[PDB]
Amino acid sequence: AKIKARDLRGKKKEELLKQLDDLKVELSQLRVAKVTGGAASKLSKIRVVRKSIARVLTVINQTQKENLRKFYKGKKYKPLDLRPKKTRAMRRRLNKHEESLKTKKQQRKERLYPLRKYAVKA
Amino acid sequence: MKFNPFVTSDRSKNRKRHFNAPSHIRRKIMSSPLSKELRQKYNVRSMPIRKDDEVQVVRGHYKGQQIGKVVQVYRKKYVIYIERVQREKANGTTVHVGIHPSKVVITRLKLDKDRKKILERKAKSRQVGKEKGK
Amino acid sequence: KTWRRWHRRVNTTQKRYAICSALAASALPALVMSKGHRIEEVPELPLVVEDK
Amino acid sequence: APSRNGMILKPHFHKDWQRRVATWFNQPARKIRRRKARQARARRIAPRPASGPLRPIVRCPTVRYHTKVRAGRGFSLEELRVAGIHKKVARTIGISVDPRRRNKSTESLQANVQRLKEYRSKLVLFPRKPSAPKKGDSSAEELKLATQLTGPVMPIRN
Amino acid sequence: SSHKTFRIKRFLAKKQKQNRPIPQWIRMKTGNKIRYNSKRRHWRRTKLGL
Amino acid sequence: GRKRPVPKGATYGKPVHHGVNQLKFARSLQSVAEERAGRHCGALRVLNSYWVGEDSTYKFFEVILIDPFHKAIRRNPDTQWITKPVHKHREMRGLTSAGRKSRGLGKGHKFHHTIGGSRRAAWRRRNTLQLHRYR
Amino acid sequence: TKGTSSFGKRRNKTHTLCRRCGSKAYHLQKSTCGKCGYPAKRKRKYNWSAKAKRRNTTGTGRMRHLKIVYRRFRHGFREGTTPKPK
Amino acid sequence: FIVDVKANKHQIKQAVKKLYDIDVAKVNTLIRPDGEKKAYVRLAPDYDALDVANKIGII
RNA sequence: CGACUCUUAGCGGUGGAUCACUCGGCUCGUGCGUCGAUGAAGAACGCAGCUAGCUGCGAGAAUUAAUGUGAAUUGCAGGACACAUUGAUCAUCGACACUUCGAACGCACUUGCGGCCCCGGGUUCCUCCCGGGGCUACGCCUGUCUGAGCGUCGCU
RNA sequence: UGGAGCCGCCGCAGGUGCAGAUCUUGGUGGUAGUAGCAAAUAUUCAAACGAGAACUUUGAAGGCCGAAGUGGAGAAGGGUU
RNA sequence: ACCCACCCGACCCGUCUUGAAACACGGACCAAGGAGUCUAACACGUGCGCGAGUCGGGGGCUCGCACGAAAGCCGCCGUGG
RNA sequence: UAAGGCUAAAUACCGGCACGAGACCGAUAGUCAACAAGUACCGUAAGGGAAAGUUGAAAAGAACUUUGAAGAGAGAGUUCA
RNA sequence: CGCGACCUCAGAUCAGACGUGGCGACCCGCUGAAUUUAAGCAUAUUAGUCAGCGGAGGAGAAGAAACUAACCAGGAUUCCCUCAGUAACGGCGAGUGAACAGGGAAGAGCCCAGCGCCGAAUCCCCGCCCCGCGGCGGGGCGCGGGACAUGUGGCGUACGGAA
Ligand SMILES: [Mg+2]
Ligand SMILES: [Mg+2]
Ligand SMILES: [Mg+2]
Ligand SMILES: [Mg+2]
Ligand SMILES: [Mg+2]
Ligand SMILES: [Mg+2]
Ligand SMILES: [Mg+2]
Ligand SMILES: [Mg+2]
Ligand SMILES: [Mg+2]
Ligand SMILES: [Mg+2]
Ligand SMILES: [Mg+2]
Ligand SMILES: [Mg+2]
Ligand SMILES: [Mg+2]
Ligand SMILES: [Mg+2]
Ligand SMILES: [Mg+2]
Ligand SMILES: [Mg+2]
Ligand SMILES: [Mg+2]
Ligand SMILES: [Mg+2]
Ligand SMILES: [Mg+2]
Ligand SMILES: [Mg+2]
Ligand SMILES: [Mg+2]
Ligand SMILES: [Mg+2]
Ligand SMILES: [Mg+2]
Ligand SMILES: [Mg+2]
Ligand SMILES: [Mg+2]
Ligand SMILES: [Mg+2]
Ligand SMILES: [Mg+2]
Ligand SMILES: [Mg+2]
Ligand SMILES: [Mg+2]
Ligand SMILES: [Mg+2]
Ligand SMILES: [Mg+2]
Ligand SMILES: [Mg+2]
Ligand SMILES: [Mg+2]
Ligand SMILES: [Mg+2]
Ligand SMILES: [Mg+2]
Ligand SMILES: [Mg+2]
Ligand SMILES: [Mg+2]
Ligand SMILES: [Mg+2]
Ligand SMILES: [Mg+2]
Ligand SMILES: [Zn+2]
Secondary structure, three states, X not given: OOOOHHHHOOOOHHHHHHHHHHHHHHHHHHHHHHHOOOOHHHXXXXXXXXXXXXXXXXXXXXXXXXXXXXXXXXXXXXXXXXXXXXXXXXXHOOXXXXXXXXXXXXXXXXXXXXXXXXXXXX | OOXXXXXXXXXXXXXXXXXXXXXXXXXXXXXXXXXXXXXXXXXXXXXXXXOOOEEEEOOOOOOOOOOEEEEEXXXXXXXXXXXXXXXXXXXXXXEEEEEOHHHEEEEEOOOOHHHHHHHHHHHHHXXXXXXXXX | OOXXXXXXXXXXXXXXXXXXXXXXXXXOHHHHHHOOOOOOOOOOOOOOOOOO | OOOOOOOOOOOOOOOOHHHHEEEOOOHHHHHHHXXXXXXXXXXXOOOOOXXXXXXXXXXXXXXXXXXXXXXXXXXXXXXXXXHOOOHHHHOOXXXXXXOOOOOOOHHHHXXXXXXXXXXXXXXXXXXOOOOOOOOOOOOHHHHOOOOOOOOOOOOOOO | OOOXXXXXXXXXXXXXXXXXXXXXXXXXXXXXXXOOOOOOOEOOEOOOOO | OOOOOOOOOOOOOOHHHHOOOOOOOOOOHHHXXXXXXXXXXXXXXXXXXXXXXXXXXXXXXXXXXXXXXXXXXXXXXXXXXXXXXXXXXXXXXXOOHHHHHOOOOOOOOOOOOOOOOOHHHHHHHHOOEEEOOOO | OOOHHHHOOOOOOOEEOOOOOOOOOEEOOOOEOOOOOXXXXXXXXXXXXXXXXXXXXXXXXXXXXXXHHHHHHHHOOOOOOOOOOO | OEEOOOOOHHHHHXXXXXXXXXXXXXXXXXXXXXXXXXXXXXXXXXXXXXXXXXXXXXX
């Protein structure tokens, strides 16, 4: 009875859509049965069927977005969705290499007058 | 005393901590001791109590030497219901009386894979502690 | 208010005097006993012990 | 309304002073925080003097202080020049260097020179790699001390 | 008014849905302090956010 | 200058504060210019400004602005201080050359006000009861 | 006449529901609010009404992005990784 | 039917057609004082309403 | 004695003081010190088998995935599950998702009108019609293309 | 009576003692079964239902509003009435 | 100390006021709340420590503070007051 | 040595996140707010803005008989009460 | 009557970037009262204070002397103690009111324009390859564009610097 993410991961895309459709259909019949008395046995299912639909849809959106960022991993400009969302301000930090840079003058200083390790009293 | 300066010792905070504890923490709180028979065997003082352990009630009205199976663990009420620990309501129907796990002693554990491993870990840390003391 | 003068300061010498007095009267079995300490069977009142 | 003899006194509590009262319940935690920070820096700058760099002997201005002598800010350039220490390098061996100090009297100069001389003598320059080149001291004067100097380096006593 | 906007209708609808009294099974819950809804509104007296 | 923005005269209060005409703004006109150029170009960052001319009714200024995000500025290490976010809106906070002048901070005896960070900081320090633990 | 009778002819309304702040304070004729200042970009707040300020600061509402920003930060703002699987 | 409030008559018509392999004459929506869009759906004369009702569950 | 009234006590009412509790405050201190066009704060409307409020969440709506945990959840139902199995329940939260207003962005705030590209029914590009998708704010920077000027020149 | 904490002595500390403030908050009296339930003509008889009818309903009679209506429909406002 | 009797005495408190039982004001009744505080500065008195000195801050050195945001110490002991 | 520029550190912090403590308050106190509180409610609106904690160890929350239309009782029972 | 340079200006749903609002204890920039005190009041005071507007950061601002001093001289800023309720201001009334030195907390110093030398020796964007890719970077290779002589880069900045 149970639909787990476990197995859905591997499955083909058309197969997932068929399962999703099938769960949505089952949901509809349960919703009708809620209106017409139905049964407590049926009015559990409605929660179970809702969460199963979510599992399928979740797995689909996982697969789709993972494939997308496989496609862009390499390209310079990539969709804002797939760009790393840290924090507005943190995305205008300096570049990690651009911080790195020393001016030629500064490099010359570090070369010529480096900080020495030393002690006193001997 | 307690020295660690990130713990609390503060009635209100430890009381809040208790009554607003989440299921998985309440598992730990609702532990109970093992019998002196099992203590000897496993090298473990106490275990989180569980749906179908066999159990003796130690203190209260139902204080007795009868070994009842646990029926259910009501972690919201911090209590466990036990096989024959029950009282007749006005209209004849029986009602499972709540016993707080700490006033109960486990005679027979329900050994699954996980429980086994917990017992193995606890006994190990005990033996490390005894070796350190020696 | 917070800025009530909570802390109170004392002359150094006076503190040192105080602590001499307090030491002095940890001898004197009478005063120790009157402070409630059951010092009936103790062998010698400035009670000094080995340094093991 | 004043009453029969006293100091005709003017307290300055006419502004909204209670809005700007600065209590001192920090101070303990502050002192601790400072001392922790201080202990960290000592650990970072491993065998260096915790103190900081060596600083110049200096007379106080004005007829009042005049007779006393302090630590100054840094060694003047004329003083370094006489000692034979390149001004850019002095900063890398732990010698303070200001370049705003004039140097009027010869008496102040020579004493400060003597200071840098003394410092250079009793300083243990570690080599850049563990494999030793010139300048860097012997492995004897190295094992016997990679020690810090607690308190101010070569202290001034008036 | 019988010439409502949609925004207004949707707002009146919500208030209508909120009015209903407490379901009696609530009162049997473990940690229950609620006996009656006390946010009930009677059209004749007390007159909407409007 | 700066005529006092009140209806008719009617600066209601004690006649110290009756003035409306002969009174003058704190910041300079060059500093106003920088500020308006900064306002307009919010992405851009105000560096500094210079004078170019003045009629009776106008002054003119030329306000140097920088992209904090054009790679030529960013990768240059001598300029990439402006790309840091403390230097947002220097002109607004009174930090450009012309804006700094009105703050009235320099070293020495001709200052003393502004002998903390700024005019406001000194007043703060001077009018705090430091109420010590022990007193 | 000034009183009771003239409470009679309060037939028509000044304000309606403001669409930014939700309050019933949007003035139809002026087409502003008077609570947030809707059409104006910046939210209206005055320092004289502290209580009015506290009636809608950040903490007030859901904080639905902001609450998960605090958690994200706590553990380190990490992205695009998972914990070690089974 | 109770329908999602965002629906057009055109969308409802297409939906019903898809779900119940039916065909519609006309859709005739209203919005309940409640918030649920009701939609009376006139089925074309070739089909009966009672038969489809039994098919879907209601009667 | 009679009724009534007054006083005192007993019991009973009314009322909720006192006392005893305290998952709340107030104050002092420590560490960190993080929001937003990648759509914030705030507002709205929704979402539960029975649920109004609070809380929690967003049409995957009392949550999905994952990881840790290891049998519950529990007001009643109903169920699942083999709790020798990715496995109940909690916690964590790194993946995914996140209705409508809102700086709020096609133009308007009726929830009204739109343009332009692509896709499915509709056609068999016949434009219509319907449905779906993606664009369509202002300001400004670097470049790009198209341009304007009896602005300053050159060659013809 | 009540059902879980509390006191003596020596020191320290205070948001430390109420009859009043037309004091603040809560409660209760006498007044008092009092004033009162008097604008716009009007009610009566029977039956039914019902534990119970001056007041509900049905029937009968007598009355009023008297088409500038106490009639029939809307606007605004209400918001499920 | 509960009630009752009798003889003698006996005006209602609070308050401002030269003068209140007042035809002066506040006060139906009961409960709980409710007003000389804290900081700074001076002065004089008193107690204690040291005495031509005295002093402690501010800082520093000693601990993760259980009690400690204490306690102790400092050519800083005296820059300085 | 002005009329150009950058720069950590000791410093601030009644907002935030997360902790710790107290000679504080103990439900008319302490935050407006110990509770479904910026809630109900009021005001056109700016804005104002409450009250409200405690059965018991455990619901064992009074089956059943009987009077009454019922609310209410009388027995019976639960509980150490 | 064209075609072509540049100069100044337009238009783009052109390619790729950024800004917009919030919070607001602390911080920077403006603006700025009046209750109040003076036993009246107008200068003063309250106070550069509340309210108002703007802009930030984890801190901000300040900061490497057009400084103090007048000494046998000190030597960026900030903070604490002290200077000091002092010098000074003031219907010299009410009231207000700093700084230097001294002792500490900390301690860190630097870069341009210019003047000059060096075939612009510099920068940005395209496009192809190898690595690296959840803070778009390195290396290589392109008669591939542009920026730039109305001045980019290296040396160099008063402590002197260059040759
Ligand atoms: Mg250079
Ligand atoms: Mg130091
Ligand atoms: Mg009405
Ligand atoms: Mg004045
Ligand atoms: Mg000037
Ligand atoms: Mg009890
Ligand atoms: Mg107290
Ligand atoms: Mg009283
Ligand atoms: Mg009567
Ligand atoms: Mg008539
Ligand atoms: Mg009608
Ligand atoms: Mg009518
Ligand atoms: Mg009297
Ligand atoms: Mg009289
Ligand atoms: Mg009077
Ligand atoms: Mg009276
Ligand atoms: Mg009292
Ligand atoms: Mg004295
Ligand atoms: Mg600066
Ligand atoms: Mg209460
Ligand atoms: Mg109460
Ligand atoms: Mg309260
Ligand atoms: Mg009470
Ligand atoms: Mg109460
Ligand atoms: Mg009670
Ligand atoms: Mg009570
Ligand atoms: Mg009892
Ligand atoms: Mg902003
Ligand atoms: Mg006056
Ligand atoms: Mg007066
Ligand atoms: Mg006056
Ligand atoms: Mg002033
Ligand atoms: Mg202000
Ligand atoms: Mg800064
Ligand atoms: Mg400068
Ligand atoms: Mg100075
Ligand atoms: Mg003095
Ligand atoms: Mg002043
Ligand atoms: Mg050059
Ligand atoms: Zn609004």
